[PDB]
Write a protein that binds this DNA or RNA. Structure first.
Ligand SMILES: CC(=O)SCCNC(=O)CCNC(=O)[C@H](O)C(C)(C)COP(=O)(O)OP(=O)(O)OC[C@H]1O[C@@H](n2cnc3c(N)ncnc32)[C@H](O)[C@@H]1OP(=O)(O)O
Ligand SMILES: C[C@H]1O[C@@H](n2cnc3c(N)ncnc32)[C@H](O)[C@@H]1O
Ligand code: MET
Ligand code: SF4
Ligand SMILES: [Mg+2]
Ligand SMILES: [Mg+2]
Ligand SMILES: [Mg+2]
Ligand SMILES: [Mg+2]
Lengths: 42, 538
RNA sequence: GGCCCCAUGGUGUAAUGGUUAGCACUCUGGACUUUGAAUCCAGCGAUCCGAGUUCAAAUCUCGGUGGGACCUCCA
């Protein structure tokens, strides 16, 4: 559940930033937290 | 009571500072101020002057390089003291019936007890009013203020302001000059020559004096008289290069007289600074650009310094009556900023701009300039347009160090030659090319065929200025983080002595100088003759 | 001794769990070779201290430290 939630949050943030790029730092923490989750799973 | 709390806060601040100095660690002043003010329950913060005014003597000596205030006041290498004369009437009141059409204040005006071209509400004006126009008191008071700030007053230069100084009786001028010299040295003299001798032997060096004068009061007599006083700089108001403007404003002279006075003064050995005024009547927005282009391209006009004074309309003058009648209108602020930017883009690299606008208080002005920082607005506009200013003031080490954060790296030697006022001028300098940073300069001129002084006839070349910038280094001291006492002066004189012998073909070299400079040039190998320091080149 | 509430820049004060705290007095610097103190324009400076709950706390739970209200006790 944590992996799914944080990955969907990362996807939402990434899509928002991408839409800003075409129109024109939560992602870092989300990526690090997902890395920690995968590390615990390992 | 807040007073003793303030005193205890101050004492604690110096206690921490001196302790940190004793065990030798760096300390941040603002955080200490805030923390210490928090303890004793205050609603304000300490001031720098108060902290300076409570240091013990030896610590006062040691820890000023951390508590100094307003570092600009000695960022050019000297300390400037401004004094004013006695109120009087301008000389051309008689044979014309009136004075310039735009000059405010004076003996016959509603500004009580004020000098001509001033209102009396200015900083220097209020200093001399309470001193009742006494040079000794003014000099002492200003030096006391400068020392209280935390600066070094080893090297001093005077500026005499007011109306036309050289139109006063001889006795008053004697009194004024000898009192200035005595105030510096500490002697009690009777006439000019005694004061000059004692000031030559003094320890608080008098670098030079500056006087403001009119073109019709700059002749051989007046030039010799100013030479005996120790003066080395002149300020003349040109205001325009157009002949119709010089007579529609009741100026009282002509432009040709200005050019002739320039020629005489430069051959005698002085330095020339010119006052100019944009936005004069009958001068549109297109004649100003042509005016200044001719000013800086025509050899008859090229000065050494400039003062830009945009026209202001003030009550009680003829221009005020013109403005009320709906016949004169000022520029719009955007147009004025654009014009000033364009003008500043034209200044040659050998010219220094001292000031950019007047200092009249805003409520007294009926129309004209209203802001107070025209220079920096103009610089920002210039950055927007893509052009750059390359005068002397905005290229020296101190200004480049406080406005930007740069330091010289690759110093080189530069020489520029030109023709001006019928003479062959050279300008030597040490500067960094890549970052555009100036360090030291020297001016040299070959005497023309119309020199009248006895000491300069027969093949003499004259040096008009030598200067090295940075912060002030006291005499006989050295500071490896500053730029003055590191040998840039004897390098600039050795080159001036080679041009004057192998290229000018002269057989003697002369220097106009102050008094501490007299001792310096005696150290180099020059002797004294008249008011000059001379040396044989054969 | 229990008993309810208060704490953000040096001082007076604003703001709703978002993805980064706004104003006033004070202070410092420049235009300025006519000026520490005036004018114009820039700048520095804060969620007391611990645990925490919620994806996330200045913000909500429980604490210590000070303060304010009730009687203290006490001698
Ligand atoms: C002549 C004129 O019109 S004025 C000269 C300019 N006026 C000024 O003082 C403003 C700044 N001036 C300066 O930088 C210097 O005073 C200059 C221009 C005279 C010489 O510049 P510098 O590069 O510093 O000189 P330099 O390093 O070659 O000489 C250093 C020596 O000069 C001495 N010196 C400097 N100024 C003076 C002075 N006014 N009187 C006597 N000696 C002096 C120093 O004490 C030092 O002597 P020491 O170290 O052997 O004891
Ligand atoms: C002292 C200097 O002030 C300048 N000056 C004199 N009157 C005015 C004015 N009304 N507005 C602007 N500058 C003025 C002149 O250039 C003079 O030389
Ligand atoms: C103080 S005004 C400038 C000096 C002199 N009065 C002149 O008009 O040239
Ligand atoms: S000569 Fe100078 S001081 Fe005298 S009235 Fe004219 S502008 Fe003013
Ligand atoms: Mg508070
Ligand atoms: Mg509040
Ligand atoms: Mg709140
Ligand atoms: Mg200020």
């Amino acid at each position: 559940a944590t992996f799914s939630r944080h990955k969907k949050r990362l996807l939402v943030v990434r899509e928002l930033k991408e839409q800003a790029q075409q129109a024109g730092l939560e992602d870092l923490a989300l990526l690090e937290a997902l890395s920690e989750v995968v590390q615990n799973t390992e | 009571s807040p007073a003793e709390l303030m005193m205890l806060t101050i004492g604690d601040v110096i206690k921490q500072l001196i302790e940190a100095h004793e065990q030798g660690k760096d300390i941040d002043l603002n955080k200490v101020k805030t923390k210490t003010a928090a303890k004793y329950g205050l609603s304000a913060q300490p001031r720098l002057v108060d902290i300076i005014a409570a240091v013990p003597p030896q610590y006062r000596k040691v820890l000023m390089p951390k508590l100094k205030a307003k570092p600009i006041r000695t960022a050019s290498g000297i300390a400037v003291v401004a004094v004013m004369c006695k109120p009087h009437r301008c000389p051309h009141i008689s044979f014309t019936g009136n004075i310039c059409v735009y000059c405010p204040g004076g003996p016959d005006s509603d500004f009580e007890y004020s000098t001509q071209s001033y209102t009396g509400y200015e900083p220097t004006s209020m200093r001399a009013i309470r001193a009742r126009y006494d040079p000794f008191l003014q000099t002492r008071h200003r030096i006391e203020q400068l020392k209280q700030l935390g600066h070094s007053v080893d090297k001093v230069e005077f500026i005499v302001m007011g109306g036309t100084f050289m139109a006063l009786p001889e006795e008053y001028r004697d009194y004024f000059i000898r009192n200035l010299h005595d105030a510096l040295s500490g002697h009690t003299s009777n006439n000019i020559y005694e004061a000059v001798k004692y000031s030559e032997r003094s320890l608080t060096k008098c670098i030079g004096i500056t006087i403001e004068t009119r073109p019709d009061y700059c002749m051989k007599r007046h030039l010799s008289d100013m030479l005996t006083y120790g003066c080395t700089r002149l300020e003349i108001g040109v205001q325009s290069v157009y002949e119709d403007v010089a007579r529609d404003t009741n100026r009282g002279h002509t432009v040709k007289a200005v050019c002739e006075s320039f020629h005489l003064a430069k051959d005698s050995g002085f330095k020339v600074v010119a006052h100019m005024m944009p936005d004069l009547p009958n001068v549109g927005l297109e004649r100003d650009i042509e005016q200044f282009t001719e000013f800086f391209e025509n050899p008859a006009f090229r000065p050494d310094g400039l003062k830009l004074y945009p026209t202001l309309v003030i009550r009680g003058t003829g221009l005020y009556e013109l403005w009320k009648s709906g016949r004169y209108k000022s520029y719009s602020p955007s147009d004025l900023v654009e014009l000033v930017a364009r003008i500043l883009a034209l200044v040659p690299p050998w010219t220094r701009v001292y000031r950019v606008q007047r200092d009249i208080p805003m409520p007294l002005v009926s129309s004209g300039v209203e802001h107070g920082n025209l220079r920096e607005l103009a610089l920002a506009r210039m950055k927007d347009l893509g052009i750059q200013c390359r005068d002397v003031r905005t290229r020296e080490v101190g200004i480049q160090e406080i406005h930007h954060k740069v330091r010289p790296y690759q110093v080189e030697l530069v020489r520029r030659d030109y023709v001006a006022n019928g003479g062959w001028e050279t300008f030597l300098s040490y500067e960094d090319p890549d970052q555009d940073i100036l360090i030291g300069l020297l001016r040299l001129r070959k005497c023309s065929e119309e020199t009248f002084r006895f000491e300069l006839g027969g093949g003499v070349s004259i040096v008009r200025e030598l200067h090295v910038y940075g912060s002030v280094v006291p005499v006989s001291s050295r500071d490896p983080t500053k730029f003055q006492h590191q040998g840039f002066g004897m390098l600039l004189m050795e080159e001036a002595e080679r041009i004057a012998r192998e290229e000018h073909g002269s057989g003697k070299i002369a220097v106009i100088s102050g008094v501490g400079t007299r001792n310096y040039y005696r150290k180099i190998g020059y002797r004294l003759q008249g008011p000059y320091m001379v040396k044989m080149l054969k």
